[PDB]
Amino acid sequence: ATLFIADLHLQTEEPAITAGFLRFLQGEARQADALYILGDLFEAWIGDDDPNPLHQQIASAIKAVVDAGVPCYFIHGNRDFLVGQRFARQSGMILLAEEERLDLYGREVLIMHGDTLCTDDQGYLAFRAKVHTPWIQRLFLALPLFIRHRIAARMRADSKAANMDVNPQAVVDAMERHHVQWLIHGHTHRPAVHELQANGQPAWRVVLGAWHSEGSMVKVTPDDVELIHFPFLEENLYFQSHHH
Ligand SMILES: CC(=O)N1CCc2cc(S(=O)(=O)N3CCN(c4cc(C(F)(F)F)ccn4)CC3)ccc21
Ligand SMILES: [Mn+2]
Ligand SMILES: [Mn+2]
């Protein structure tokens, strides 16, 4: 069974999500053939030299899964597109490109974060092209940490004040470029299974959920595809004395 997660948005202000991810890693992920994280693991990222302790805690927990024999892969999200090869080494995770095609027990599956499918949000596309320009990233990463913190906090406030689903033709385009009948992504926070047609045959798009009140994962076995929602922490059972 292969596991897919996305859109956790880990941040120190939300310790329950972090505790839920740690429990996931020490329970579900240890039994997997592989773990794919399709972007937005963290709520923000300004470079791998950030001494934010949460980054180290998360890196050590993933590395433990990797050391238990479960390979771990990461595709960048729109929030954490600056995760680099230093963090990859500390966590044992492999960085993948923005589009990848996998063989999952015989079925060809395309995986991506999903933000590049949102071709109607032309404000987002302009922002994305900017911060994904290599010379603009290198210039930003070369600034002092305290400068990068101030820039990022200001850009986050500017986006909340300036406040989309995928384009259907963009879905078909990618699934036909890669000649696949299965696509897995996140980003939209709308967990669903969508049926469509691609390459003259039935096709499916599986969307992950964000970790808001509960966790979410897609599990792919040789027999089925599973969208699974679960609580973060171990919810102990206790009884209330209801009356007939
Ligand atoms: C829509 C969206 O995706 N948004 C909205 C707002 C925001 C904030 C962060 S961030 O806080 O994590 N952060 C901000 C600063 N980033 C930069 C900045 C520059 C430069 F200053 F040169 F333009 C270059 C390269 N990267 C890294 C990421 C992530 C994502 C999104
Ligand atoms: Mn997200
Ligand atoms: Mn996203």
From TrEMBL:
<dbReference type="InterPro" id="IPR010138">
    <property type="entry name" value="UDP-diacylglucosamine_Hdrlase"/>
</dbReference>
<feature type="binding site">
    <location>
        <position position="9"/>
    </location>
    <ligand>
        <name>Mn(2+) 1</name>
    </ligand>
</feature>
<dbReference type="GO" id="GO:0005737">
    <property type="term" value="C:cytoplasm"/>
</dbReference>
<feature type="binding site">
    <location>
        <position position="78"/>
    </location>
    <ligand>
        <name>Mn(2+) 2</name>
    </ligand>
</feature>
<feature type="binding site">
    <location>
        <position position="40"/>
    </location>
    <ligand>
        <name>Mn(2+) 2</name>
    </ligand>
</feature>
<comment type="pathway">
    <text>Glycolipid biosynthesis; lipid IV(A) biosynthesis; lipid IV(A) from (3R)-3-hydroxytetradecanoyl-[acyl-carrier-protein] and UDP-N-acetyl-alpha-D-glucosamine: step 4/6.</text>
</comment>
<comment type="function">
    <text>Hydrolyzes the pyrophosphate bond of UDP-2,3-diacylglucosamine to yield 2,3-diacylglucosamine 1-phosphate (lipid X) and UMP by catalyzing the attack of water at the alpha-P atom. Involved in the biosynthesis of lipid A, a phosphorylated glycolipid that anchors the lipopolysaccharide to the outer membrane of the cell.</text>
</comment>
<feature type="binding site">
    <location>
        <position position="187"/>
    </location>
    <ligand>
        <name>Mn(2+) 2</name>
    </ligand>
</feature>
<feature type="binding site">
    <location>
        <position position="7"/>
    </location>
    <ligand>
        <name>Mn(2+) 1</name>
    </ligand>
</feature>
<dbReference type="GO" id="GO:0008758">
    <property type="term" value="F:UDP-2,3-diacylglucosamine hydrolase activity"/>
</dbReference>
<dbReference type="Pfam" id="PF00149">
    <property type="entry name" value="Metallophos"/>
</dbReference>
<keyword id="KW-0443">Lipid metabolism</keyword>
<feature type="binding site">
    <location>
        <position position="189"/>
    </location>
    <ligand>
        <name>Mn(2+) 1</name>
    </ligand>
</feature>
<feature type="binding site">
    <location>
        <position position="159"/>
    </location>
    <ligand>
        <name>substrate</name>
    </ligand>
</feature>
<keyword id="KW-0441">Lipid A biosynthesis</keyword>
<dbReference type="GO" id="GO:0030145">
    <property type="term" value="F:manganese ion binding"/>
</dbReference>
<keyword id="KW-0378">Hydrolase</keyword>
<dbReference type="InterPro" id="IPR043461">
    <property type="entry name" value="LpxH-like"/>
</dbReference>
<feature type="binding site">
    <location>
        <begin position="78"/>
        <end position="79"/>
    </location>
    <ligand>
        <name>substrate</name>
    </ligand>
</feature>
<feature type="domain" description="Calcineurin-like phosphoesterase">
    <location>
        <begin position="1"/>
        <end position="191"/>
    </location>
</feature>
<keyword id="KW-0444">Lipid biosynthesis</keyword>
<keyword id="KW-0472">Membrane</keyword>
<feature type="binding site">
    <location>
        <position position="121"/>
    </location>
    <ligand>
        <name>substrate</name>
    </ligand>
</feature>
<feature type="binding site">
    <location>
        <position position="163"/>
    </location>
    <ligand>
        <name>substrate</name>
    </ligand>
</feature>
<keyword id="KW-0464">Manganese</keyword>
<keyword id="KW-1003">Cell membrane</keyword>
<keyword id="KW-0997">Cell inner membrane</keyword>
<feature type="binding site">
    <location>
        <position position="113"/>
    </location>
    <ligand>
        <name>Mn(2+) 2</name>
    </ligand>
</feature>
<feature type="binding site">
    <location>
        <position position="187"/>
    </location>
    <ligand>
        <name>substrate</name>
    </ligand>
</feature>
<protein>
    <recommendedName>
        <fullName>UDP-2,3-diacylglucosamine hydrolase</fullName>
        <ecNumber>3.6.1.54</ecNumber>
    </recommendedName>
</protein>
<keyword id="KW-0479">Metal-binding</keyword>
<comment type="similarity">
    <text>Belongs to the LpxH family.</text>
</comment>
<dbReference type="InterPro" id="IPR004843">
    <property type="entry name" value="Calcineurin-like_PHP"/>
</dbReference>
<dbReference type="GO" id="GO:0009245">
    <property type="term" value="P:lipid A biosynthetic process"/>
</dbReference>
<feature type="binding site">
    <location>
        <position position="40"/>
    </location>
    <ligand>
        <name>Mn(2+) 1</name>
    </ligand>
</feature>
<dbReference type="GO" id="GO:0019897">
    <property type="term" value="C:extrinsic component of plasma membrane"/>
</dbReference>
<dbReference type="InterPro" id="IPR029052">
    <property type="entry name" value="Metallo-depent_PP-like"/>
</dbReference>
